């Protein structure tokens, strides 16, 4: 949020004339906020449009943020915490599996107009299991592939 302003004088307004003669329609693209109108604004000062100049060199330099070294992409993590994480995930998967059919059975025993409000205080396994599936698949696939190519990159 950045704005730019210039002042005006009231004597010229006494003459029945308004400043900032208009020659084109590119000056009225943004409507002012109500709080700017609440204060002085057009009866005391006028805002002007703003722009940012961009060149290729600084923009190309600036995109290096959060880039990581070539070491971080070849480490294959410990083979002891990975199985612990998989074991942890599988149990909640099992519990959500057990809780799924209870909500599946009663999906139509109640009028659908209040169906949405029925899910306002308690969790639903259908939405709460997909994230487990996604993270689990991603971790397993990437951990396999890293070791797969590393077995032959080095000797």
């Amino acid at each position: 949020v950045i704005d730019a302003f210039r002042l005006i004088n009231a004597n010229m307004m006494v003459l029945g004339h308004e400043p900032r003669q208009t020659t084109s329609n590119l000056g009225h693209l943004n409507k002012p906020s109500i709080q700017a109108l609440i204060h002085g604004l057009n009866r005391h000062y006028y805002s002007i449009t703003i722009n940012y100049r961009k060149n290729e060199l600084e923009q190309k330099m600036l995109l290096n943020l959060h880039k990581k070294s070539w070491m971080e992409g070849l480490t294959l993590q410990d083979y002891s915490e990975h199985c612990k994480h998989n074991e942890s995930v599988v149990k909640e998967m099992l519990e959500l599996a057990k809780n799924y059919n209870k909500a599946v059975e009663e999906e139509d025993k109640m009028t659908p107009e209040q169906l949405a409000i029925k899910n306002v205080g308690k969790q639903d396994p259908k939405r709460h299991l997909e994230e487990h599936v996604d993270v689990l698949m991603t971790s397993n696939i990437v951990q396999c592939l890293a070791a797969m190519l590393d077995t032959v990159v080095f000797k």
Partner: protein, 116 residues
């Protein structure tokens, strides 16, 4: 009889045909069967007596056993023959998977995160 390994009945019936001579084809079958039996004996044996081959293959003692062994090289004499098998080529190497399994995982990832 030929489909499975039973071979004695083939040569037994080869001297018993009620239709006609049929000798133009039984000889070809005999040659092929003798060759394949020679091929089979080469496997799963590290020791055998010289006369045992003469018993299994119906040429008894026509001097053809030594020329036949010249055809199928064999190794040693002393009334004995030997064969050697390795079969460890497929095991003990993980480099051969390293590329095809990488391709398979790449395929999983490719067909897992494309908008259809």
């Amino acid at each position: 009889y030929l489909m499975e390994g039973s071979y004695n009945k083939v040569f037994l019936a080869k001297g018993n045909i009620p239709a006609e001579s049929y000798t133009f084809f039984i000889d070809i079958l005999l040659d092929t069967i003798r060759d394949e039996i020679a091929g089979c004996i080469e496997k799963a044996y590290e020791k055998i007596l010289f006369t045992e081959a003469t018993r299994i293959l119906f040429f008894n003692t026509p001097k053809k056993m030594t020329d036949y062994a010249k055809k199928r090289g064999w190794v040693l004499g002393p009334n004995n023959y030997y064969s050697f098998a390795s079969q460890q080529q497929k095991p003990e190497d993980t480099t051969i998977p390293s590329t095809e399994l990488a391709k398979q995982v790449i395929e999983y990832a490719r067909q897992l995160e494309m908008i259809v």
